[PDB]
């Protein structure tokens, strides 16, 4: 609404702010984010620690599909199957361990973070990580790859 703004209340006073000495001129100090190297040096280099220059390895075409490897930590691994499957530690047609197909659930690379339950499991994925498998094999599970 515009029945609440500042101006619809700052109507009487001679200028809506913007003082009377340095008046609200059109564009004092260049259009847009100009300067940068000449008189807004202070701001541009104490609020953006670097804006000028470049860093190498130009890469001429990055189809962002040869690097689509989303991940999931162990401490979030056990939430891909229902709670019921896990309910069975040794019971109701559940032997040593079930299998979780992380690619089937959408995640490729299984990272490692946090503390995983003491219950043997099988993980299927494309990419493991050193801790992500040291913990998995310490628990009593096993790791399996795909394409």
């Amino acid at each position: 609404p515009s029945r609440l703004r500042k101006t619809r209340k700052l109507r009487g006073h001679v200028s809506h702010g913007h003082g009377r000495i340095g008046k609200h001129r059109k564009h004092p100090g260049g259009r847009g984010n100009a300067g940068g190297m000449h008189h807004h040096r202070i701001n541009f280099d104490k609020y953006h620690p670097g804006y000028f220059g470049k860093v190498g390895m130009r890469h001429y075409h990055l189809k962002r599909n040869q690097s689509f490897c989303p991940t999931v930590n162990l401490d979030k691994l056990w939430t891909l199957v229902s709670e019921q499957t896990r309910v069975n530690a040794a019971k109701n047609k559940t032997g040593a361990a079930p299998i979780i197909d992380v690619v089937r659930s959408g995640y490729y690379k299984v990272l490692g973070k946090g503390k995983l339950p003491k219950q043997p499991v099988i993980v299927k994925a494309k990419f493991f990580s050193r801790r992500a498998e040291e913990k998995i094999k310490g628990v009593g599970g096993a790791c399996v790859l795909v394409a």
Binding site: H27, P28, G29, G30, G32, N33, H40, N43, F44, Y47, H48, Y51
Partner: protein
């Protein structure tokens, strides 16, 4: 003429960018039109499957 951020944006052709679209008030009318066209042709070729092949 900044104070905190450094983000720059496209919409400025000094000869106007106004002269391009605002009209999307079609949207409901266009939905009605396309839906009615599907009703029509699905009636015209009756027994053949809706989505065709």
């Amino acid at each position: 003429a900044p104070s905190r951020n450094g983000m720059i944006l496209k919409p400025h052709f000094h000869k106007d960018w106004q002269r391009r679209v605002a009209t999307w008030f079609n949207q409901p009318a266009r939905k009605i039109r396309r839906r009615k066209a599907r009703q029509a042709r699905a009636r015209r070729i009756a027994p053949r499957p809706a989505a065709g092949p």
